[PDB]
């Protein structure tokens, strides 16, 4: 064994960003992030992904965002928007949450064990009580109202 054959080293995938309806409008506000949440596996992957965030309404962590526990009715009642194409969670701890946009259903997954580019059936099932409106395969949301 004195010759190594070719084996790959680098693996870079460069996707495009999550598309949204131009004519529906944008409204986004920066919120502080919860330190108890492991934000590494939420921003893990090259894939285009959105996910819902809730907010702590009171307590010692009030005003901090955390991803929405769909099995908790209190975290469903406190949803505030989506994080679109996640940022540098390591250098900064203040994420821009979009409160009003129009996103296709293929780009929103809650579970880490959920494939990308596919509709999350847990988000479609709770979309009445998540204040989501599914029209033409797109989520319509506005949390200013």
């Amino acid at each position: 064994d004195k010759i190594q054959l070719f084996r790959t080293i680098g693996r870079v995938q460069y996707w495009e960003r999550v598309p949204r309806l131009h004519a529906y409008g944008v409204f986004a506000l920066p919120f502080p992030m919860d330190p108890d949440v492991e934000w590494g596996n939420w921003f893990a992957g090259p894939h285009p992904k959105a996910f819902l965030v809730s907010v702590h309404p009171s307590g010692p962590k009030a005003g901090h965002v955390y991803p929405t526990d769909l099995s908790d009715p209190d975290s469903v009642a406190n949803v505030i928007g989506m994080v679109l194409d996640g940022h540098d969670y390591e250098a900064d701890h203040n994420v821009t949450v979009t409160l009003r946009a129009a996103v296709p259903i293929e780009y929103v997954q809650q579970g880490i064990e959920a494939p990308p580019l596919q509709p999350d059936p847990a988000v479609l099932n709770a979309a009445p009580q998540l204040k989501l409106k599914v029209i033409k395969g797109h989520y319509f949301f506005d949390y200013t109202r």
């Binding site: 054959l5 070719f6 790959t8 080293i9 995938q13 960003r17 285009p48 296709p104 780009y107």
Partner: protein, 51 residues
């Protein structure tokens, strides 16, 4: 094969491969008095190898 000389003791090879995204994906269908719809996301990728 002929013979060659190198004055070294090891030789290494590096290969860099690129794969662009194709301009595919027909067009979305419209009706005259309504608004448009957004276009899906594509993917490009690169690898590199060593012997």
């Amino acid at each position: 094969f002929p013979e060659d000389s190198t004055f070294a003791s090891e030789l290494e090879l590096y290969l860099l491969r690129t794969q662009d995204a194709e301009q595919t994906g027909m067009t979305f269908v419209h009706q005259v008095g309504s608004t448009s719809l957004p276009v899906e996301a594509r993917v490009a990728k690169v690898d590199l190898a060593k012997a």
